[PDB]
Amino acid sequence: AVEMYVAVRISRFQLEVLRDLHDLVRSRTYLDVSKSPLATTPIRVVEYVR
Amino acid sequence: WTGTQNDLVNVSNHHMAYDEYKKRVAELQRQGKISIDVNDKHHIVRVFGDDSTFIMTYDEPPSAEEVHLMCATFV
Numbered sequence: 001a002v003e004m005y006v007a008v009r010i011s012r013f014q015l016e017v018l019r020d021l022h023d024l025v026r027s028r029t030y031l032d033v034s035k036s037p038l039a040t041t042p043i044r045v046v047e048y049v050r
Numbered sequence: 051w052t053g054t055q056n057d058l059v060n061v062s063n064h065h066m067a068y069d070e071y072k073k074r075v076a077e078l079q080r081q082g083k084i085s086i087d088v089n090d091k092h093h094i095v096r097v098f099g100d101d102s103t104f105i106m107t108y109d110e111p112p113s114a115e116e117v118h119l120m121c122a123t124f125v
Contacts, residue, residue: 048089050079 057097064095064102071124084119088112 078084090106
């Protein structure tokens with residue numbers, strides 16, 4: 001009723017359906033700074049001990 | 051010999067003051083303040099009778115508050 005004589009419609013649609021809750025999990029990667037920490041103070045030469 | 055005596059005395063205590071100013075600056079450097087890599091290379095002292103001047107050169111110029119800290123330490 002809120003639409004007019006001619007109707008505008010959509011031909012294709014893509015949606016993901018799931019069957020079990022266990023499937024809802026995915027995975028991403030990180031650095032684990034515990035063993036490979038991010039660096040600071042890059043390599044320098046020694047000229048001023050003190 | 052008044053001028054000679056004045057310039058001899060003025061250039062003498064300057065060395066002894068710089069000697070201990072170096073120690074104080076080294077103390078501040080080991081703690082976190084002036085920071086490392088702020089070390090002078092050439093220092094020149096010029097004396098004309100009573101009046102005297104002191105010029106120190108650096109490779110990397112210390113920031114503004116570093117200058118205040120080191121000048122206060124020297125004085």
